[PDB]
Design an enzyme around this catalytic site. Sequence first.
Site, PDB file in Angstrom:
ATOM      1  N   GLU B  61       0.839  -1.179   0.000  1.00 27.30           N
ATOM      2  CA  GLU B  61       0.000   0.000   0.000  1.00 27.30           C
ATOM      3  C   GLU B  61       0.879   1.235   0.000  1.00 27.30           C
ATOM      4  OE1 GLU B  61      -3.913   0.398   0.329  1.00 27.30           O
ATOM      5  OE2 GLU B  61      -2.663   1.815  -0.830  1.00 27.30           O
ATOM      6  N   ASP B  89      -2.030  -5.346   1.185  1.00 28.68           N
ATOM      7  CA  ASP B  89      -1.352  -4.225   1.846  1.00 28.68           C
ATOM      8  C   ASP B  89       0.106  -4.506   2.213  1.00 28.68           C
ATOM      9  OD1 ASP B  89      -3.543  -2.196   1.972  1.00 28.68           O
ATOM     10  OD2 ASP B  89      -4.485  -3.588   3.334  1.00 28.68           O
ATOM     11  N   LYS B 115     -14.774  -8.082   3.801  1.00 27.51           N
ATOM     12  CA  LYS B 115     -13.542  -8.213   3.035  1.00 27.51           C
ATOM     13  C   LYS B 115     -13.053  -9.653   2.957  1.00 27.51           C
ATOM     14  CE  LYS B 115     -11.672  -3.536   2.953  1.00 27.51           C
ATOM     15  NZ  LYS B 115     -11.806  -3.619   1.473  1.00 27.51           N
TER      16      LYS B 115
HETATM   17  O1  LIG Z   1      -8.446  -1.497   3.216  1.00 26.41           O
HETATM   18  C1  LIG Z   1      -9.331  -1.125   2.421  1.00 26.41           C
HETATM   19  O2  LIG Z   1     -10.527  -0.850   2.705  1.00 26.41           O
HETATM   20  C2  LIG Z   1      -8.910  -0.910   0.989  1.00 26.41           C
HETATM   21  N1  LIG Z   1      -9.900  -0.596   0.149  1.00 26.41           N
HETATM   22  C3  LIG Z   1      -9.613  -0.364  -1.127  1.00 26.41           C
HETATM   23  C4  LIG Z   1     -10.780  -0.013  -2.021  1.00 26.41           C
HETATM   24  C5  LIG Z   1     -11.194  -1.119  -3.008  1.00 26.41           C
HETATM   25  C6  LIG Z   1     -10.288  -0.859  -4.202  1.00 26.41           C
HETATM   26  C7  LIG Z   1     -10.381   0.643  -4.338  1.00 26.41           C
HETATM   27  N2  LIG Z   1     -10.408   1.075  -2.937  1.00 26.41           N
HETATM   28  C8  LIG Z   1     -10.074   2.289  -2.487  1.00 26.41           C
HETATM   29  O3  LIG Z   1     -10.147   2.564  -1.302  1.00 26.41           O
HETATM   30  C9  LIG Z   1      -9.574   3.275  -3.520  1.00 26.41           C
HETATM   31  C10 LIG Z   1     -10.220   4.602  -3.262  1.00 26.41           C
HETATM   32  C11 LIG Z   1      -9.479   5.656  -2.774  1.00 26.41           C
HETATM   33  C12 LIG Z   1     -10.056   6.870  -2.516  1.00 26.41           C
HETATM   34  C13 LIG Z   1     -11.397   7.032  -2.750  1.00 26.41           C
HETATM   35 CL1  LIG Z   1     -12.125   8.577  -2.424  1.00 26.41          CL
HETATM   36  C14 LIG Z   1     -12.172   6.005  -3.231  1.00 26.41           C
HETATM   37  C15 LIG Z   1     -11.572   4.790  -3.481  1.00 26.41           C
HETATM   38  N3  LIG Z   1      -8.317  -0.435  -1.583  1.00 26.41           N
HETATM   39  C16 LIG Z   1      -7.275  -0.760  -0.736  1.00 26.41           C
HETATM   40  O4  LIG Z   1      -6.117  -0.818  -1.175  1.00 26.41           O
HETATM   41  C17 LIG Z   1      -7.605  -1.011   0.595  1.00 26.41           C
HETATM   42  O5  LIG Z   1      -6.578  -1.322   1.408  1.00 26.41           O
HETATM   43 MN   LIG Z   2      -6.384  -2.314   3.392  1.00 30.03          MN
HETATM   44 MN   LIG Z   3      -4.518  -1.633   0.163  1.00 28.12          MN
END
Ligand SMILES: O=C(O)c1nc([C@@H]2CCCN2C(=O)Cc2ccc(Cl)cc2)[nH]c(=O)c1O
Ligand SMILES: [Mn+2]
Ligand SMILES: [Mn+2]
Lengths: 177, 177
Positions: B61, B89, B115
Amino acid sequence: MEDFVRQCFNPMIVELAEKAMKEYGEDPKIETNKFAAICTHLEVCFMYSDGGSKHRFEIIEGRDRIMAWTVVNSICNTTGVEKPKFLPDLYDYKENRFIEIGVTRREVHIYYLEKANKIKSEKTHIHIFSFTGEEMATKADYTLDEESRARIKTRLFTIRQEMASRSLWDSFRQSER
Amino acid sequence: MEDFVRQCFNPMIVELAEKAMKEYGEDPKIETNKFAAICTHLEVCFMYSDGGSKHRFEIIEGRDRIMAWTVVNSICNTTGVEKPKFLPDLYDYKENRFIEIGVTRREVHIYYLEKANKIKSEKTHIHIFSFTGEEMATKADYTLDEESRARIKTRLFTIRQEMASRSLWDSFRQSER
Ligand SMILES: O=C(O)c1nc([C@@H]2CCCN2C(=O)Cc2ccc(Cl)cc2)[nH]c(=O)c1O
Ligand SMILES: [Mn+2]
Ligand SMILES: [Mn+2]
Ligand SMILES: O=C(O)c1nc([C@@H]2CCCN2C(=O)Cc2ccc(Cl)cc2)[nH]c(=O)c1O
Ligand SMILES: [Mn+2]
Ligand SMILES: [Mn+2]
């Protein structure tokens, strides 16, 4: 020599080195010696940030420009060290100074003077390594313990020997300018 | 709440979090709660990679997509672990497994199931933290020692309390979806 670079440095270093060359319009498949030189300087920077304590070193080289300047400006705002004109390679928390790292196939003291007369930063420290194991730094201060430093020259020597084993060292030793 | 995020997380985290939101067309000045949530998840990831040995954890990440996939593919080629479908991550060298990290203001076990049912990766481990200190992971395996873990919840609790001191916690506790 292109294949050698890919079998010698980890994929994250290769990728970083190609992006930097392409960012300057040079082709890694063609300027194979500059390719290897970027990789080596990159690997030495990662190893310097490894000696000493776990968090002694903030690393600047290898980040995109925005993040890189984000780090340096953040350090200057907190500690008050003078802000460098050019992106240096690491920050040394224990000593409150930015570090520049040079790796040369030429003679170590000339490269010191070259990057001293262009840095013009009073509070940026220069530390230079060679593939033949001759190292040269500022005010006779060399930051890391002899043990961390030795591991870096040993790695540099090891690169030299396998370039020679594939008969690449001579051309790699001439290209530098 | 915008000012709070900037006075709470180091500038490298802020910058990383803005780029990610802009990459999805969201405005950090407006979606101030998502802003804070991205920062916290980012800071927790950096702290997880800090417990254990100096090189126990490769962090995924926070890198651009190309470098991020460069790391994961490089690990799969060397060790032979199954290649994840989604960017996880961290990688855990001691245990030969990719880690996913979740931070939720909601209840820890629901976020686990959410998740889990979307990861569909047999060999990716899930580890979930809450601001109230309830943590939930896979197969009851929690990787870090109680001491590293405690420092992360203490940090998470500390965030909660100052959001409350500025009376931001309630709105930040509702926004999650
Ligand atoms: O831990 C988590 O919840 C986690 N969730 C994600 C989700 C799913 C894939 C995209 N995404 C984003 O968050 C991108 C995004 C970033 C900013 C905004 Cl405004 C909206 C979306 N991606 C992870 O890498 C992660 O670690
Ligand atoms: Mn995450
Ligand atoms: Mn991530
Ligand atoms: O140690 C050093 O010699 C060192 N030199 C530089 C020089 C000066 C600033 C630009 N530059 C490049 O190398 C970019 C470039 C990258 C690839 C190609 Cl093909 C050509 C140029 N920049 C450093 O960050 C650094 O550490
Ligand atoms: Mn540099
Ligand atoms: Mn340098």
